[PDB]
């Protein structure tokens with residue numbers, strides 16, 4: 306039982322349960338500040354998405370769209386199926402110090418259960434059509450809603466896919482490491498109104514403080 | 528008591544003491560097989576060594592040359608002081624599957640205790656002059672020897688300092704992560720008998736099995 310505030314806030318996650326120990330002692334945690342950058346000859350990430358956003362949930366921590374099987378990405382010659390995607394506000398990652406009002410995470414897992422997460426950052430701009438579909442059918446804490454017209458996550462990704470990569474963790478407990486982070490450089494857009502609705506629904510900030518890089522470097526596509 | 532053989536051996540380390548837990552749950556462990564390589568514009572590592580190798584130690588696990596303060600490397604704009612260098616046989620790291628008969632670790636530390644280790648691999652050849660100076664006056668088990676003539680770790684490093692870099696751990700308990708690994712590509716040389724003395728003295732292999740890369744990539748300087 307964790308939250309973003311107070312007794313159950315981020316600085317205390319590591320002590321709440323024994324399962325949450327990596328939140329306290331891990332040295333490869335997320336989010337981070339994309340700062341220690343190095344140009345590296347990374348390959349374009351092959352993406353095969355389909356309209357699979359079948360249901361929408363509110364676990365009180367985020368708004369999560371569950372994904373039905375068949376959509377995936379390839380990283381390191383390994384196929385990771387898209388399982389779900391959710392949002393944080395403000396952004397969990399900061400880029401060169403810069404904080405963004407909104408962030409989307411696309412969570413994938415391969416046959417052995419290893420995760421690869423795509424992070425997409427948003428700025429204030431035009432009302433976003435995909436978000437509007439999700440926002441229309443926004444449930445209350447604990448509740449889920451099935452969707453007759455399924456959503457496609459590819460449309461939330463920027464058109465230009467140049468990305469940062471690094472080895473990090475889940476940004477919520479148990480903060481397990483060994484997560485491949487793929488952070489898109491190009492910023493997406495949603496309205497100021499769309500952001501505010503989200504925040505109210507959650508009860509404030511929903512981001513974990515940036516975590517030290519320590520020995521890591523952030524790689525940037527050539 | 529941890530060792531390289533049996534029930535106190537590497538597959539069992541994580542289970543012995545709670546202080547060793549990262550050895551079993553860690554996902555950014557060392558050594559690794561240097562395989563998933565990506566070309567990166569890494570900076571040339573600035574090295575300022577002086578003849579500072581003052582004493583030799585036998586802790587039963589390795590032969591450690593303690594270094595007097597004053598020698599350092601610069602990584603990520605941070606000054607990492609050389610504290611010591613020690614040995615393993617065979618190599619802890621492997622390059623493209625290839626294992627070496629002998630490996631040197633140069634352990635450095637910054638203001639806050641963050642470690643950055645340079646790894647050098649050796650192949651068989653003629654008598655290594657620097658290894659010989661060390662070999663001709665090994666201590667009795669557990670005890671130390673001041674050297675009278677200071678050793679320069681610089682002479683154990685190859686002429687070409689082209690390197691692989693990655694985020695890993697100590698290769699011995701407690702296997703703490705957050706370690707900067709810098710592995711030189713160019714192979715150094717020492718004799719087959721110099722290798723054998725070290726092996727008989729240690730009682731066999733003194734390397735941890737390679738650990739999975741998991742989410743990591745190895746960067747290679749361009």
Ligand SMILES: [Zn+2]
Nearest residue numbers: 391393410476
């Ligand atoms: Zn997230």
Ligand SMILES: [Zn+2]
Nearest residue numbers: 613615632698
């Ligand atoms: Zn070592």
